[PDB]
RNA sequence: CAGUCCCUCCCGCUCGGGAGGAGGCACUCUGGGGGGACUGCCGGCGAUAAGCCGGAGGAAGGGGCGGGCGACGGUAGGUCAGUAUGCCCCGAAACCCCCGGGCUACACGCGCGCUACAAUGGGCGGGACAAUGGGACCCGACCUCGAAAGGGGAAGGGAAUCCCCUAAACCCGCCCUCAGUUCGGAUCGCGGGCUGCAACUCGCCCGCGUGAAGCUGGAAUCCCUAGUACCCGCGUGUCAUCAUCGCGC
């Protein structure tokens, strides 16, 4: 089963199937990703799911675009959609929207364009 | 720390120089004047049910005018 | 001896087509046109504001 | 790298950072109980629309707020005892992982010095650093005069956290002593109403002045 | 298992100490007198710096497949000071990694695909993934969860 | 050895050799660690245990850098004006060589010497509101 | 097995649209297979210039934009089909480039 | 390896793990049409109007968000040194061409920028990350050599198809441990490299030596309100080189 999730410019395509429990981002294990803070948010959603479903399926997600943290956000975003699609269980959906509404909603924030008069510093950054 | 917590029950309206300060009404939940209603001043945003801390129950704000 | 030296580079190399200035000549895929000139002719190019 | 993956997996049972589940922590002061967030979270970094709501700071976790206060300490109007407190070199802003690591180490330092949950030490430090009086100018006919004022609890939280961060950053500045040690020491001093905590001292100062401007 | 299943920070050191055995790779005479990059201001602190570099280079051949001189130069390039002007990104030197590539090819671990770069031999693949399986069999003990 | 004299200039034994050599004017950290490697010693070891044989090795390296493996371009004044050889200037041998360069620039009435005589920037820097 | 790749460039989306309608309605009349019209990423050209003719005054700039739309249509090699493409009336704004690939 | 029978290769505990070709449109991406958000519904306020506040649901609510378009008139503001232009001056000069210098020069007052004043750091390896664009006397992979600046060849590409191309900020394992110094590089010499006929006046880069002030800055005062402010880099105009320049990502 496929699932998509966008963030900033990060886009994540996840495929999940019956399996041991291995979770692979870009073909790399979920447990040895060097950014620890990003690893925590990557591993946040499935914790509420329970180890049964953690060990009942295998998940592989490929991300591209944005930064590492945007990539982690997109990965978690797509993860929640994929897993709730597999279960089709309302109770877990309630658990997610209790913990975080963006799990099945997403953050539509995007960068504002920079404007003249010191364009580099930002849309709202001006001289003295 | 012999402070007197009290509960916001009503907001009279903005006051003070900049209008940042808010004139509020507070009910004394504890101490020697339990249950008393006091007009008081607040700095920082306020809601209906904030537990304002009081150094004294003696101070009551002057009535605001329009 | 009264002929200008051909200049392949430098500001003297390029020249606005319309008004004949040596100043800012914009070359977005080669217009060879002055900055003041571009304003009066952009809508005629089909350019549009957005 | 064993500590890294260890700390990664140990909070698998829903714990702040890596350790110190918050059921033990208790909010003694009645005012900040309905305003300090103690919800169970693994990573305290929402990126959420807390700014875009009137009271979106109620739902932000306390440690997240502490990291946010640490985020923005260098270079501004304030010159504590004639010091342009400025972080030219690798400023914490736009780098939340660095502050995350620094507060991680500060939590450990608080824990082993106190032999208890660092989070409860933070709660006590904030409770003991919170001012109870301020002043404001009120006029009538143009004649200004200062008037004593009470503070909304959330503002008390804000100023206490910012003052703790101020003291930590000032202490580490220009000095051999590292930043996490400064922060942990500031927290420890604040927890027990020690007058050398910049936060607690400035709390005493603001609680004065308003004392005589009633 | 594969290199993808282990951290690179430990794997590069393991590969460096393993390749230190084979004499095909050797720092030339100018090696100890040249810093590791144009973007770098100071000489390498350690003297094993050579054997890590190859241990890095070969690693990318396992990942990025056929890659030539210039893209590798770009990957190792970094941020350097420019006086009062702010820092800027620059490219690592050429010969430093070029001779490393020649040494790796002569060792038979890698081969060349002209017009595309250099790819990794099945011998090099088997060597790297044997090191990786060694490391993973190790790591599964200190970290049980990697068994999954 | 809290004090270790090398080629006429003292070094503190507390400092590492790559840092101790930098106390020598005319030798930098990039030269300090590179002669540390040429001597075969750890760059970071304490100079307090610098036995005199290492000192003799250091000064004999300084006698001829190229003969000890130091490249022709790691020297400060390669292709010397008076012999066409690459030698690493140091101490007074650096000082009077630069003084000779200054005399050379002065006697030719060139711009560089003109600025050197007047205390002005050789390389055409703008001094309308600076210096 | 031989196909014709056709690339149509147009600044006007509609001038492109009716020409695409012509070439697609050729297909089913001719009874020859036709892969759907592929819309390439529309190419945006941006040019910015300060409004002031002299130097005085604040800084104000004008950003002019040209959007040129690119579309691909790939069709089989049918002599009767391709005989009717040069008879297509094309507007001046639109341009057509055809390659015949195997 | 959406799934993918088929074929090949590497590991292994032979279960399984990974890469390449076929493969079809899953899904991403892209561009054409349409819907969705309309105070739409509920409660209160508002005179029962206009409208406001609150609540639900919903990706998105109270002009959804960000932009373009900015009148009547004035500023004898500036622009005739871009164009057109009245009056007046010269008209072998105030016309044209060329050479050389200058347009930088200097005790400073002064607007706006960059760096420094370091534990945050400095140094060594590895790990995860963009899009704006731009490319034919061009982008140039890739091969070879030089430590490098760069040099010889050259695939692909006149553009979803080739290239600029990697991110940096961040973390991991380790050394230096607080000093005007293991910070900072100005200034100064040598050699080498690059564009242009030529770069002292008047360009940039590579290596060595060199190390300047500055250790937070009074009066005063600017900016900002959500992907916003701060930090970090990249593309692009002028351009053969040259930005701490301007616009954009």
Curated annotation (Swiss-Prot), chain A:
Keyword annotations from UniProtKB, A to Z: Ribonucleoprotein, Ribosomal protein
Record field: compositional bias (Basic and acidic residues): 104-115
InterPro entries reported in the protein's UniProt record: Ribosomal_Su5_D2-typ_SF, Ribosomal_uS9, Ribosomal_uS9_archaeal, Ribosomal_uS9_CS, Ribsml_uS5_D2-typ_fold_subgr
Single GO MF annotation: structural constituent of ribosome
Superkingdom, natural source: Archaea
SUPFAM superfamilies in the record: Ribosomal protein S5 domain 2-like
Protein name stated in the entry: Small ribosomal subunit protein uS9
Curated annotation (Swiss-Prot), chain C:
Pfam families cross-referenced by the UniProt entry: Ribosomal_S14 (PF00253)
GO cellular component: cytosolic small ribosomal subunit
Single GO biological process annotation from the record: cytoplasmic translation
Cofactor: Zn(2+)
Family, as annotated: Belongs to the universal ribosomal protein uS14 family. Zinc-binding uS14 subfamily.
Classification via HAMAP family: Ribosomal_uS14_2_A
PANTHER family documented for this protein: 40S RIBOSOMAL PROTEIN S29
Protein name: Small ribosomal subunit protein uS14
UniProtKB/Swiss-Prot annotation, chain F:
Pfam name, any one: Ribosomal_S13
Assigned keywords, A-Z: Ribonucleoprotein, Ribosomal protein, RNA-binding, rRNA-binding
Assigned GO CC terms: cytosol; small ribosomal subunit
Domain of life: Archaea
InterPro entries xref list: Rbsml_uS13_C, Ribosomal_uS13, Ribosomal_uS13-like_H2TH, Ribosomal_uS13_archaeal, Ribosomal_uS13_CS
Alphabetized GO MF terms: rRNA binding; structural constituent of ribosome
RNA-binding listed as a keyword: yes
Disulfide bonds: none
Recorded family membership: Belongs to the universal ribosomal protein uS13 family.
Protein's job: Located at the top of the head of the 30S subunit, it contacts several helices of the 16S rRNA. In the 70S ribosome it contacts the 23S rRNA (bridge B1a) and protein L5 of the 50S subunit (bridge B1b), connecting the 2 subunits; these bridges are implicated in subunit movement.
Subunit text: Part of the 30S ribosomal subunit. Forms a loose heterodimer with protein S19. Forms two bridges to the 50S subunit in the 70S ribosome.
Name the record gives this protein: Small ribosomal subunit protein uS13
Lineage, broadest ranks: Archaea, Methanobacteriati, Methanobacteriota, Thermococci, Thermococcales
Curated annotation (Swiss-Prot), chain G:
UniProt-listed GO biological process terms: translation
Assembly description: Part of the 30S ribosomal subunit.
Alphabetical list of Pfam families matching this protein: Ribosomal_S10
Annotated region (Disordered), positions in chain: 33-59
NCBIfam families cross-referenced by the UniProt entry: uS10_euk_arch
Lineage, highest ranks first: Archaea, Methanobacteriati, Methanobacteriota, Thermococci, Thermococcales
Sorted UniProt keywords: Ribonucleoprotein, Ribosomal protein
Highest taxon above the source species: Archaea
GO MF annotation terms: structural constituent of ribosome; tRNA binding
Chain's role: Involved in the binding of tRNA to the ribosomes.
A Gene Ontology cellular-component term: small ribosomal subunit
Similarity comment: Belongs to the universal ribosomal protein uS10 family.
InterPro entries according to UniProt: Ribosomal_uS10 (IPR001848), Ribosomal_uS10_CS (IPR018268), Ribosomal_uS10_dom (IPR027486), Ribosomal_uS10_dom_sf (IPR036838), Ribosomal_uS10_euk/arc (IPR005729)
Name of the protein in question: Small ribosomal subunit protein uS10
Gene transcribed to yield this protein: rps10
PANTHER family named among the record's database cross-references: 30S RIBOSOMAL PROTEIN S10 FAMILY MEMBER
Coiled coil residues, start to end: none
């Amino acid at each position: 089963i496929q699932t998509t999730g966008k963030r900033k410019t990060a886009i994540a395509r996840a495929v999940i199937r019956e399996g041991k429990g291995r979770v692979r981002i870009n073909g790399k294990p979920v447990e040895i990703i060097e950014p620890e803070i990003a690893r925590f948010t990557i591993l946040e959603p499935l914790i509420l799911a329970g180890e049964e479903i953690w060990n009942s399926v295998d998940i592989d997600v490929k991300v591209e675009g944005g930064g590492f943290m945007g990539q982690a956000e997109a990965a978690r975003m797509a993860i929640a959609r994929a897993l709730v699609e597999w279960t089709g269980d309302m109770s877990l959906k309630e658990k997610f929207m209790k913990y975080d509404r963006t799990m099945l909603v997403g953050d539509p924030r995007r960068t504002e364009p920079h404007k003249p008069n010191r364009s580099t510093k930002g849309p709202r950054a001006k001289r003295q | 720390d012999e402070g007197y917590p009290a509960e916001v029950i009503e907001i009279i309206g903005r006051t003070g120089t900049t209008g940042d300060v808010t004139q509020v009404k507070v009910r004394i939940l504890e101490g020697r004047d339990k249950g008393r209603v006091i007009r008081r001043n607040v700095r920082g945003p306020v809601r209906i049910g904030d537990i304002l801390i009081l150094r004294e129950t003696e101070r009551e704000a002057r009535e605001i005018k329009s | 001896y009264n002929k200008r030296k051909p200049r392949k580079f430098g500001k003297g190399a390029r020249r606005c087509i319309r008004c004949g200035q040596y100043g800012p000549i914009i070359r977005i895929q080669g217009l060879m046109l002055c900055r003041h000139c571009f304003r009066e002719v952009a809508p005629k190019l089909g350019f549009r504001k957005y | 790298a064993k500590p890294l993956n260890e700390r990664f997996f140990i909070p698998h049972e829903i714990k702040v950072m890596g350790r110190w589940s918050t059921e033990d922590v208790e909010v003694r002061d009645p005012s900040l109980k309905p305003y300090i967030n103690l919800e169970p979270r693994l990573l305290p970094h929402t990126h959420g629309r807390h700014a875009k709501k009137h009271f979106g700071k109620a739902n932000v976790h306390i440690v997240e707020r502490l990291i946010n206060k640490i985020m923005r300490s260098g270079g501004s109007h304030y010159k504590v005892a004639g010091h342009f407190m400025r972080r030219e070199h690798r400023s914490l802003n736009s780098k939340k992982v660095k502050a995350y690591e620094v507060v991680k180490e500060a939590f450990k330092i608080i824990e082993q010095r106190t032999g208890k949950n660092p989070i409860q030490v933070l709660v006590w430090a904030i409770e003991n650093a919170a001012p109870r009086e301020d002043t404001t100018s009120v006029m009538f006919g143009g004649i200004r005069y200062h008037v004593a004022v009470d503070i909304s609890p959330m503002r008390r939280l804000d100023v206490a956290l910012r003052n703790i961060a101020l003291g930590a950053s000032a202490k580490c500045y220009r000095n051999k002593m590292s930043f996490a040690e400064a922060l942990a020491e500031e927290i420890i001093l604040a927890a027990n109403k020690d007058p050398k905590s910049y936060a607690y001292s400035k709390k005493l100062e603001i609680e004065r002045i308003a004392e005589s401007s009633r | 298992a594969t290199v993808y299943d282990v951290p690179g920070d430990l794997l590069v050191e393991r590969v460096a100490q393993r390749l230190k055995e084979i004499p095909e790779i050797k720092p030339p005479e100018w090696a100890p007198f040249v810093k590791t990059g144009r973007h770098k201001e100071r000489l390498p602190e350690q003297e094993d710096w050579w054997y890590y570099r190859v241990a890095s280079i070969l690693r990318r051949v396992y990942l990025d497949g056929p890659v030539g001189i210039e893209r590798l130069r770009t990957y190792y390039g970094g941020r350097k000071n420019r006086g009062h002007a702010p820092e800027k990104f620059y490219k690592a030197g050429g010969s430093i990694i070029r001779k490393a590539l020649q040494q790796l090819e002569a060792a038979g671990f890698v081969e060349k695909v002209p017009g595309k770069g250099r790819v990794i031999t099945p011998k090099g693949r088997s060597f790297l993934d044997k090191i990786a399986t060694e490391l993973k069999k190790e790591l599964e003990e200190i970290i049980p969860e990697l068994k999954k | 050895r809290h004090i270790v004299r090398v080629a006429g200039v003292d070094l503190d034994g507390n400092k590492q050799l790559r840092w101790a050599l930098t106390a020598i004017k005319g030798i930098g950290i990039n030269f300090a660690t590179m002669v540390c490697r040429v001597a075969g010693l750890d760059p970071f070891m304490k100079a307090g245990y610098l036995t005199d044989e290492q000192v003799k090795k250091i000064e004999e390296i300084l006698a001829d850098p190229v003969a000890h493996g130091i490249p022709r371009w790691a020297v400060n004044r390669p292709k010397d004006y008076e012999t066409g050889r690459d030698l690493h200037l140091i101490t007074a041998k650096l000082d009077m060589a630069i003084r000779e360069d200054i005399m050379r620039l002065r006697r030719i009435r060139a711009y560089r010497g003109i600025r050197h005589e007047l205390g002005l920037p050789v390389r055409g820097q703008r001094t309308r509101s600076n210096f | 097995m031989q196909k014709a790749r056709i690339k149509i460039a147009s600044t006007n989306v509609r001038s492109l649209d009716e020409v695409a309608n012509q070439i697609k309605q050729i297909a089913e009349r001719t009874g020859v297979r036709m892969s759907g019209p592929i819309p390439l990423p529309t190419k945006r050209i941006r040019i910015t210039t300060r409004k002031s003719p002299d130097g005085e005054g604040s800084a104000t700039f004008d950003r002019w934009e040209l959007r040129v739309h690119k579309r691909l249509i790939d069709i089989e090699a049918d002599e009767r089909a391709m005989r009717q493409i040069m008879r297509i009336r094309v507007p001046e704004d639109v341009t057509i480039e055809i390659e015949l690939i195997s």
